[PDB]
Enzyme design. Structure first.
Site, PDB file in Angstrom:
ATOM      1  N   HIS A   1       0.642  -1.185   0.547  1.00  0.00           N
ATOM      2  CA  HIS A   1       0.126   0.058   0.217  1.00  0.00           C
ATOM      3  C   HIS A   1       0.703   1.333  -0.194  1.00  0.00           C
ATOM      4  O   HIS A   1       0.224   2.326  -0.240  1.00  0.00           O
ATOM      5  CB  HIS A   1      -0.838  -0.161   1.398  1.00  0.00           C
ATOM      6  CG  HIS A   1      -0.113  -0.477   2.235  1.00  0.00           C
ATOM      7  ND1 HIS A   1      -0.227  -1.721   3.185  1.00  0.00           N
ATOM      8  CD2 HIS A   1       0.048   0.865   3.657  1.00  0.00           C
ATOM      9  CE1 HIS A   1       0.399  -1.281   4.009  1.00  0.00           C
ATOM     10  NE2 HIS A   1       0.682   0.099   4.354  1.00  0.00           N
TER      11      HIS A   1
ATOM     12  N   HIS B   1       8.074   6.861   4.945  1.00  0.00           N
ATOM     13  CA  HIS B   1       6.880   6.520   3.277  1.00  0.00           C
ATOM     14  C   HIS B   1       6.020   7.663   2.732  1.00  0.00           C
ATOM     15  O   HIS B   1       5.973   8.791   3.853  1.00  0.00           O
ATOM     16  CB  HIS B   1       5.965   5.255   3.643  1.00  0.00           C
ATOM     17  CG  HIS B   1       4.877   5.303   5.085  1.00  0.00           C
ATOM     18  ND1 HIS B   1       5.421   5.586   6.213  1.00  0.00           N
ATOM     19  CD2 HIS B   1       3.758   6.018   4.802  1.00  0.00           C
ATOM     20  CE1 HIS B   1       4.036   6.100   7.098  1.00  0.00           C
ATOM     21  NE2 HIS B   1       3.065   6.593   5.810  1.00  0.00           N
TER      22      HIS B   1
ATOM     23  N   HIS C   1       1.991   9.135   1.267  1.00  0.00           N
ATOM     24  CA  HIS C   1       1.279   8.989   0.420  1.00  0.00           C
ATOM     25  C   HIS C   1       0.811   9.730  -0.695  1.00  0.00           C
ATOM     26  O   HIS C   1       1.503  11.156  -0.632  1.00  0.00           O
ATOM     27  CB  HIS C   1      -0.506   9.514   1.490  1.00  0.00           C
ATOM     28  CG  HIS C   1       0.001   8.358   3.398  1.00  0.00           C
ATOM     29  ND1 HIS C   1      -0.711   7.254   3.556  1.00  0.00           N
ATOM     30  CD2 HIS C   1       0.731   8.548   4.108  1.00  0.00           C
ATOM     31  CE1 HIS C   1      -0.412   6.811   4.049  1.00  0.00           C
ATOM     32  NE2 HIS C   1       0.420   7.677   4.834  1.00  0.00           N
TER      33      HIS C   1
ATOM     34  N   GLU D   1      -2.513  13.131   3.169  1.00  0.00           N
ATOM     35  CA  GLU D   1      -3.651  13.390   4.741  1.00  0.00           C
ATOM     36  C   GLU D   1      -3.902  13.614   5.227  1.00  0.00           C
ATOM     37  O   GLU D   1      -5.684  14.665   4.938  1.00  0.00           O
ATOM     38  CB  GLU D   1      -3.431  12.132   5.192  1.00  0.00           C
ATOM     39  CG  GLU D   1      -2.988  10.663   4.527  1.00  0.00           C
ATOM     40  CD  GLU D   1      -2.573   9.547   4.952  1.00  0.00           C
ATOM     41  OE1 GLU D   1      -1.773   8.940   6.051  1.00  0.00           O
ATOM     42  OE2 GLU D   1      -3.114   8.592   4.703  1.00  0.00           O
TER      43      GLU D   1
ATOM     44  N   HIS E   1       5.789  11.115   6.041  1.00  0.00           N
ATOM     45  CA  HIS E   1       5.637  10.221   7.464  1.00  0.00           C
ATOM     46  C   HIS E   1       6.975   9.833   7.708  1.00  0.00           C
ATOM     47  O   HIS E   1       7.352   8.052   6.422  1.00  0.00           O
ATOM     48  CB  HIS E   1       4.010   9.802   7.273  1.00  0.00           C
ATOM     49  CG  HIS E   1       3.464   9.838   6.990  1.00  0.00           C
ATOM     50  ND1 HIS E   1       2.161   9.662   6.598  1.00  0.00           N
ATOM     51  CD2 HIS E   1       3.098  11.219   7.146  1.00  0.00           C
ATOM     52  CE1 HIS E   1       1.197  10.300   7.073  1.00  0.00           C
ATOM     53  NE2 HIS E   1       1.483  11.536   6.775  1.00  0.00           N
TER      54      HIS E   1
ATOM     55  N   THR F   1      -2.585   6.478   9.792  1.00  0.00           N
ATOM     56  CA  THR F   1      -3.832   6.077   9.237  1.00  0.00           C
ATOM     57  C   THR F   1      -3.541   5.186   8.496  1.00  0.00           C
ATOM     58  O   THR F   1      -4.832   5.640   7.380  1.00  0.00           O
ATOM     59  CB  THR F   1      -3.311   7.790   8.144  1.00  0.00           C
ATOM     60  OG1 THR F   1      -2.364   7.152   7.631  1.00  0.00           O
ATOM     61  CG2 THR F   1      -2.987   8.674   9.610  1.00  0.00           C
TER      62      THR F   1
END
Ligand SMILES: NS(=O)(=O)c1cccs1
Ligand SMILES: [Zn+2]
Length: 258
Positions: free
Chosen positions: A62, A92, A94, A104, A117, A196
């Site tokens: 993911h 990582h 998003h 996010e 993050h 999250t």
């Protein structure tokens, strides 16, 4: 057949397997800059990343994680709203399918192209698995990415992505210096929140930096070429791996700056 970011298994569905998804301290949230409270009691952040030892980069289905040796106090975060010492374990991102979404957290409802993050755990709990069970177990430093000029310090990460295109692939990734990912200013907002992604545990002190970093369109384009699937499976591009903002409920966001 498990959680993900698709129409059938995405964030709106997670509460069925992880009821904490509807809890009192979920993340991310929208940071409303006018109702954030300046707190003069907050200390500057202390980021000590000079001895960081990166090990490996992994596509976990993911996101992709860059992992660090956390068997000693080599790369630590202290100060700010934290008591004690938190060790860096992985970072990582998003990101979105388009430049106008991907982050996010949001700032006055504004979305950025991506969010970085840097994940740290409280050394008093001895290992990461024990830390996530505690309300002060993790500290995650959140940095926004906007699209503009390229970030030179990110390019080594971008160039290795072709080698971990599908879920479960990993590559050796040594001597990467995370200092090249930081903005100039370390001013921040902070609030108590959660992971999250599942298991969505409410164990995180969030520290979100006010100043975004810039990356180029070519750099973020390369993130969008990764796959959620394993090799040999039908191709699903890894994009929009972000959870939408959750209710703030009974929480106050504090700012280190006025
Ligand atoms: N995205 S995050 O930083 O809240 C996270 C999920 C799992 C480990 S760390
Ligand atoms: Zn994350």
């Amino acid at each position: 057949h498990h959680w993900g970011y698709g129409k059938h298994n995405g964030p709106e569905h997670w509460h069925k397997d992880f009821p904490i998804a509807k809890g009192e301290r979920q993340s991310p949230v929208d940071i409303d800059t006018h109702t954030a409270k300046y707190d003069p009691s907050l200390k500057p952040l202390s980021v000590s990343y000079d001895q960081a030892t990166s090990l490996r980069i992994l596509n976990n289905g993911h996101a992709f994680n860059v992992e660090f040796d956390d068997s000693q106090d080599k790369a630590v975060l202290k100060g700010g709203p934290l008591d004690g010492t938190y060790r860096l374990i992985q970072f990582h991102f998003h990101w979105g399918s388009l430049d106008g979404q991907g982050s996010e957290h949001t700032v006055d409802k504004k979305k950025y192209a991506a969010e970085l993050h840097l994940v740290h755990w409280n050394t008093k709990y001895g290992d990461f698995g024990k830390a996530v069970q505690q309300p002060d177990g993790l500290a995650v430093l959140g940095i926004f990415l906007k699209v503009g000029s390229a970030k030179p310090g990110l390019q080594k990460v971008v160039d290795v992505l072709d080698s971990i295109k599908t879920k479960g692939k990993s590559a050796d990734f040594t001597n990467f210096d995370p200092r090249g990912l930081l903005p100039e200013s370390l001013d921040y907002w902070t609030y108590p929140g959660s992971l999250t992604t599942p298991p969505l545990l409410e164990c995180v002190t969030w520290i979100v930096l006010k100043e975004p970093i810039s990356v180029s369109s070519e750099q973020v384009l390369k993130f969008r070429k990764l796959n959620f699937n394993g090799e040999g499976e039908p191709e699903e591009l890894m994009v929009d791996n972000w959870r939408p903002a959750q209710p703030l409920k009974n929480r106050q966001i504090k700012a280190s700056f006025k």
